Amino acid sequence: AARRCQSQLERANLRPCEQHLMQKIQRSQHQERCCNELNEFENNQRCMCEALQQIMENQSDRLQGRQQEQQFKRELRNLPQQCGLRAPQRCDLDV
Amino acid sequence: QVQLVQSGGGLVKPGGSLRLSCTASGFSFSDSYMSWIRQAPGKGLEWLTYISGSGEIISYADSVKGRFTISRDNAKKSVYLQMDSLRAEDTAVYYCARPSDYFETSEELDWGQGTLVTVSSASTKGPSVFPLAPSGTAALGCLVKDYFPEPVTVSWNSGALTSGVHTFPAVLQSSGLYSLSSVVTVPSSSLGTQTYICNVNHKPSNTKVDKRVEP
Amino acid sequence: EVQLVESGGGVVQPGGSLRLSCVASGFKFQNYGMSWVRQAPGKGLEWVADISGSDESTYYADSVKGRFTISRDTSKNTLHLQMSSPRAEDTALYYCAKATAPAGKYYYYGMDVWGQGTTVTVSSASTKGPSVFPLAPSSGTAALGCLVKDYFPEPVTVSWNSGALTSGVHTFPAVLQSSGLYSLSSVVTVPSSSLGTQTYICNVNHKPSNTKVDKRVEPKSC
Amino acid sequence: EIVMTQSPSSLSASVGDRVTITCRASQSISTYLNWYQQKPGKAPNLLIYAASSLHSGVPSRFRGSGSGTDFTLTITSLQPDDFATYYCHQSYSAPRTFGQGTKLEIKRTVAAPSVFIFPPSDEQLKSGTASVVCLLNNFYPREAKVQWKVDNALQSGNSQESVTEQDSKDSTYSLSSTLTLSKADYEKHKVYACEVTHQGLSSPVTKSFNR
Amino acid sequence: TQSPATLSLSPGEIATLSCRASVSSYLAWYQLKPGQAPRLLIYDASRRAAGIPARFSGSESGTDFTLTISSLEPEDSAVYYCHQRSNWPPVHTFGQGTKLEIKRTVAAPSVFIFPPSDEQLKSGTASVVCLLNNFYPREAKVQWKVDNALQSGNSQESVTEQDSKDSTYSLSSTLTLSKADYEKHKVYACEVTHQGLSSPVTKSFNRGE
Ligand SMILES: [Zn+2]
Ligand SMILES: [Zn+2]
Ligand SMILES: [Zn+2]
Ligand SMILES: [Zn+2]
Ligand SMILES: [Zn+2]
């Protein structure tokens, strides 16, 4: 169960989610791909959470300050919903 | 440390409008959903509506869609509920609720103190107190009838009689006024050798009554 | 100190079979993906194979699929590469490499620790240990050296006075002679003023034939 | 709306028992099922979220299970503070919905009610209304029938009942039934009675008075 | 594709390398120093491996990504490889590489000639070695002369990689003859030409002296 999610995450291409979120903040090509990728974790709360957490992990070094960090987190919490998916009820994104 | 401080509510006539407000501290209000939940007298919890942190996502229960409106002001850390076209059915205690996290699926966790909303065309009226007279152990009581709004207080001999006392919850009558009964069970012997009095108090109308209860 | 120590290199006949090994230490081997990367003589790096650290699934370059097998031990912190249908194009130095990012991540952060590498040669030629001949100095700065001639396969390693002499040492890349055998020289510059009082020994080692040689290099008395 | 259906609606048990409440959703809600406890006058307290996860501070005796449509809350060893009402709650899709609730009462021996009938006071009759009260005192279980008869005629739609919660000392209920009439109607009959039916009574009990 | 295949710059200059990225992928850069395992410099196209100085940096611009090294030091002499991994199923590709030479001032070679050892002669073969040590640039010509006759096709030479400290090269040229052919000649010489030599240099010996 926990190992099965480990393997699904190694197989995932969540870079379009990063791009969709960064271009969404700058103001789709990447949303269609990102949502298909997030769909692999739909209705699996622990694994959807870990995916969102790994997106935060990958983006921690590339954000320029706390305020940019909080704006990115906000947009990330809305990404499952904007894909027609359920977010996890609880998921710590403080990396 | 989370605090949810509600305000507003009260008495309103059918078809009227009330506005409930809720102020929050101790969490990232602007990232959190917020919701309103009510509970009518003796009924179950009824989820009503919620609003996302941005205000762009809103949902209403079928029982309330089209009549209530939820809104929020993140700068004031406050969420509001405009209740319009109220009906007697809407009488309930209304709760502000904060979820356990910052997603649209996060479950309610912290609740405000609750606000009593009463929808009634009635006017404030003091109760009438009539005895329930005796005839191993005997029974006697007082009937507190035709009062509005709730509540009323009832003791016996000014707190000297407590054992065997059953003060029933009030019922709402077809007239829109409330009624209840308080009864006490005592030995048959003590009846003639004991004076029993019920002390009825109705603060909204400024009424006090000390009716004798004789066989 | 993370360490990756490869082993098992040598000569293998075409169509034979050879097994490389890589012993890992200094980190939680089980929690990382691992790779084999090779470098052919006079060419650049070329990825060979990956093995996942979460499910042990395996991935191979197209030029290798169906002839190599990567695996890892569960009881030992050891990685393996089995070469089952070796071809001449497979002759190369073979690197063991550790993934930067732990297993379970969708992102890839390259390979942050690499082994020293092991040399694999695919041919029908026979193993042969070298002959070590002195390069005598002088007869200011003098130069002496060590001629390591007629060995197969690569590699040989050359130190001087058991590692205590490192400054000035130049060990040249081997050249393939017309006979199909390899030869190289190791030279070192020294003070000419002390050539009659200082001792100089080149230590040569050829693992494929278990050959260790120590040859003193002295000025010739004429 | 996703309908949440809890069973049972009521449940009696003793300290130390193993209780199980079930909740059935109108559709597959995956693991987005939550369980709350509510004591009277108090706001609900979350027990379980995500259908299996204990909230911080919730004792281990509470356990949740299920995925899809069918869910269960279990209390392994009931404690004195566990007697309350329990609700399930889906956050799978908005609008959210609670189940109708499940009240957990204290079990004890059957006990027949002491029945008492009261005629309306004369002071009340001078106002033009007559209230006749039937009292059932300190019984258990709650299930009881109260039937008003006026001159041997069964009354319908002119009475209202009111019940108390379980008593601290004896864990019993008390109930009142009030028959309301006008003075005019009240004085057109002679016999007023309430028939009380309860399993603790071998036969129905009737308490009557004559105007 | 990687560009440029070769590069020669002076210390304190700025080196910029670039590869043409080929869908979603993760980009890395490695340094291969002489006689050493590869070393990760940049990963994810702009992030710096631990222990790597701010002198190294990477960036990307569409279908191209680059590595830059600013305060070039002699230690930076090495071959550099770009590295791309596709997303699952992982496919790895490396660039052809970039050989980075660090420039220095002209340094003429010290030349040495070694006659065959008597031990080798007892083996039936004879190798004559001409050593060129610690010179720059890498261009150099070595002609063998035996009894003043220019040799042609009986010599192999071998050259080191650029030293990390002094930025010089070293070169050996080995004339290989049969013992019989070696014993029939008298004079052996190698002639060295180099930019640091006003005139070609010759080192020689007479067999037996
Ligand atoms: Zn987008
Ligand atoms: Zn009682
Ligand atoms: Zn093994
Ligand atoms: Zn009548
Ligand atoms: Zn000659």
Numbering used by the authors:
A (entry chain E): 29 to 55, 85 to 152
B (entry chain C): 1 to 135, 142 to 221
C (entry chain A): 1 to 139, 145 to 227
D (entry chain D): 1 to 211
E (entry chain B): 5 to 26, 29 to 215
Sentences from the paper on this structure:
We focused on Ara h 2 because it is the immunodominant, most clinically relevant peanut allergen. Ara h 2 is a 2S albumin seed storage protein that is an 18 kDa protein composed of 4 α-helices. This small protein is remarkably resistant to proteolytic and enzymatic digestion, resulting in the likely preservation of conformational epitopes. Here, we compared antibodies from individuals with sustained or transient responses and discovered specific tolerance-associated conformational epitopes of the immunodominant allergen Ara h 2 recognized by neutralizing antibodies.
The ternary complex of Ara h 2 bound to Fab fragments from antibodies in conformational bins 1 and 3 (13T1 and 22S1, respectively) was solved, revealing the 2 nonoverlapping bins residing on opposite sides of the Ara h 2 structure. In the 13T1Fab–Ara h 2–22S1Fab ternary complex, these 2 bins were nonoverlapping and bound at sites located almost 180 degrees from one another on Ara h 2. The bin 1 epitope space covers the N-terminus of Ara h 2 containing helixes 1, 2, and 4, while bin 3 covers the C-terminus surrounded by helixes 4 and 5, respectively. Bin 1 and 3 epitope residues form multiple hydrogen-bonding interactions and salt bridges with residues on complementarity-determining regions (CDRs) of 13T1 and 22S1. Among them, the most contacts were made by residues on the CDR 3 of the heavy chain (CDRH3). One noticeable feature at the interface is the tight packing of key residues against a charged groove formed by the helices and loop of Ara h 2. The side chain of the Y106 of the 13T1 CDRH3 packs against the negatively charged groove formed by helixes 1, 2, and 4, whereas the F103 of the 22S1 CDRH3 snugly fits into the positively charged pocket formed by helix 5 and the C-terminus. The 13T1 epitope (bin 1) contains 4 overlapping amino acids with the sequential epitope 30DRRCQSQLER39. The 22S1 epitope (bin 3) contains the 5 overlapping amino acids with epitope 130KRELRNLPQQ139 and 1 overlapping amino acid with epitope 121QGRQQEQQ128. Curiously, both epitope 1.2, recognized by antibodies 13T1 and 13A4, and epitope 3, recognized by antibodies 22S1, 06B1, and 27A4, were epitopes specific to antibodies from sustained responders.
